[PDB]
Design a protein around this ligand. Sequence first.
Ligand SMILES: *[C@@H]1O[C@H](CO)[C@@H](O[C@@H]2O[C@H](CO)[C@@H](O[C@@H]3O[C@H](CO)[C@@H](O)[C@H](O)[C@@H]3O)[C@H](O)[C@H]2NC(C)=O)[C@H](O)[C@H]1NC(C)=O
Ligand SMILES: *[C@@H]1O[C@H](CO)[C@@H](O)[C@H](O)[C@H]1NC(C)=O
Ligand SMILES: *[C@@H]1O[C@H](CO)[C@@H](O)[C@H](O)[C@H]1NC(C)=O
Lengths: 118, 132, 231, 231
Amino acid sequence: NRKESKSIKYWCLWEGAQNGRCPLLVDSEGWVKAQYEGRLSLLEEPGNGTFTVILNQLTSRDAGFYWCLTNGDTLWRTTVEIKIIEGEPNLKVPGNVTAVLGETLKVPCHFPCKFSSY
Amino acid sequence: ERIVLVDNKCKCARITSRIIRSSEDPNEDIVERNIRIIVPLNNRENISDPTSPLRTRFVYHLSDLCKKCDPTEVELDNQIVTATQSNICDEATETCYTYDRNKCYTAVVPLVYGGETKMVETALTPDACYPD
Amino acid sequence: CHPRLSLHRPALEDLLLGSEANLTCTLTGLRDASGATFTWTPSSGKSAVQGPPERDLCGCYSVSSVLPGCAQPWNHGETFTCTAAHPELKTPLTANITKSGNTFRPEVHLLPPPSEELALNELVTLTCLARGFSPKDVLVRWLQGSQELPREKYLTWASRQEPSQGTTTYAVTSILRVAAEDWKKGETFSCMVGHEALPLAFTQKTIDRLAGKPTHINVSVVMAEADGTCY
Amino acid sequence: CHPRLSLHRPALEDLLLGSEANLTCTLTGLRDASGATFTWTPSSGKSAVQGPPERDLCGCYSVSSVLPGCAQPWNHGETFTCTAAHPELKTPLTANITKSGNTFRPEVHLLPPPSEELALNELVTLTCLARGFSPKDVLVRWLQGSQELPREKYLTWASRQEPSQGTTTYAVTSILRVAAEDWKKGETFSCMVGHEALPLAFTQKTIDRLAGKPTHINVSVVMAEADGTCY
Ligand SMILES: *[C@@H]1O[C@H](CO)[C@@H](O[C@@H]2O[C@H](CO)[C@@H](O[C@@H]3O[C@H](CO)[C@@H](O)[C@H](O)[C@@H]3O)[C@H](O)[C@H]2NC(C)=O)[C@H](O)[C@H]1NC(C)=O
Ligand SMILES: *[C@@H]1O[C@H](CO)[C@@H](O)[C@H](O)[C@H]1NC(C)=O
Ligand SMILES: *[C@@H]1O[C@H](CO)[C@@H](O)[C@H](O)[C@H]1NC(C)=O
């Protein structure tokens, strides 16, 4: 809600084991879970009605139901389902890049041609 | 009277429909279509004040009532494409027959204040023009 | 015999659903399949790799090439200037290509099935007719519910030009046969059409059994002296 | 160069109307000059015309001739042997042409106009459709009342085959655009279809207004002093 813009934002993952539980994964104040290191972050843009969250390096066990929740007085809780279907990633990067001791590195990253205006 | 096909507010018309299926003789069923028109007997032709007499002729075309143009999303192979849903809504120019309860309508009238004249604004539906 | 040079446009399918607008450049009418060099005037990703000297009139030489490069300049109206310099001629000759103007956008219509075909309870036909478009390229896909049907379940004809009401326009048709059980149950079917003159490049029409000819019609006209606000 | 397989039957557009049936059978493969040899095993008073050659793949030639034998031997089942000979290798794959079997009839539907075009007062459009016939030869004509329209007012696509279950069948469409004043007068229109698996060689369908009219109409007028609108 626009009238609650000074809130604190959270991102759950619905466990469904015992009765139902939110382990929190990332907050708007600078904390993330341990096992989701390097693959999760919360972003404040575009703002004014909406925030976004980025989750990459997917695996087929990452499917499930996910919750988001604010800190204000009126709480909409919104649920989205992440499905996993098979295919190929658009952007293309190498494997896990090492480093030399005493000289430079360079790492490439392609993109296809529908992303030519982005 | 079960599934709403259109509920239009510039012309104030509503159309529902329903399949009611007999089990005997499966070659023939019946499909119902209900139309409701509400005719305003005291509106002008253009919506300003001094325009013209009472509108006395009311014309409804079914292809312009049911017209749907806000875009949609279609998934073709693994892609999300935006499509339009109609041929005919080139941008308004539609003549409305009634007011709409969630939009507000104003007019501009010149009056005098001793010296020169101003450009006073006037509400035509006062329930909906409250500035908040 | 005679050597000539011809230039084809990019296909419609990879321009809309993708963006990779590979071009081509064909000369035919030679018999010595080693000497050929091509030249384009805009060439930043210049590595245009030539194609195989494939079959011709009883196994003669006929060679072409491909320039990669995706679909941002083609929509703004650039130009491309392939020329050939083979040794079986004493002249380099050139043609060009440009995204054409003077275009019109099509009008799409879906037609409900015929009445006599529903009385037999076997299969029913849906027809998709698109009309009045100025280039000669179009797409037609079909969908069930929100699921796209595979391409081998429907038949699509070719694009031809219609009788002249002054300026030239074209037409195309397509049919799809579905089971007469889920038509009467109430599933929905869509016909989608893609063409270059439409603003969002796509348009859709959806039909089902409720949005067709009804058997019964109830009309209720209510006269309202009260107000003109339409609650 | 290399000999191939080619076929040419009598024309249906002259077989259903007149009796000017001409047989012309083909066998090509061009390396040598005129070494002409025939097979016309019924030759009962026919003289085969021959003429000049025409253009081919830069040097080659090909030959054929015509027999006017329309005394009904073709729709009986004569086999009308086609077999070449030359000072060359005496191993042909041969052509033996007859009226074919396992034939099916077409099923013809004629569709009404879309209601979007009616409410604009311009030209309106009609659609003919036939599907399910076993050889791919068909004729399509239009009528207005009893007058056959000239065949440059309407567009007809080709004849293509369908996705199916075992048995193979074909389909074809056509359209005709008329003025809305002629539709709203009450003038009728018709689509005629010719095919050789039909017993009388023709079928018709006819359309106008008042064809898909509904059979029940309820009109209730609610006066003043009785408004009871619900949200
Ligand atoms: C129905 O009536 C309304 C009310 O008269 C019409 O709207 C207004 O029509 C006037 C007359 O041309 C337009 O005048 C313009 O006003 C501006 C000031 O805003 C002035 O600077 C211009 O020089 C010009 O005189 C005005 O654009 C227009 N719209 C408004 C005020 O929002 C309306 O056009 C009528 N509709 C029909 C179909 O007759
Ligand atoms: C482009 O084509 C036009 C007409 O075909 C002609 O001016 C010439 O062949 C080409 N001109 C340029 C500048 O490429
Ligand atoms: C006609 O030629 C074909 C070519 O293979 C052959 O299969 C067929 O048997 C021939 N007809 C007769 C009657 O021999």
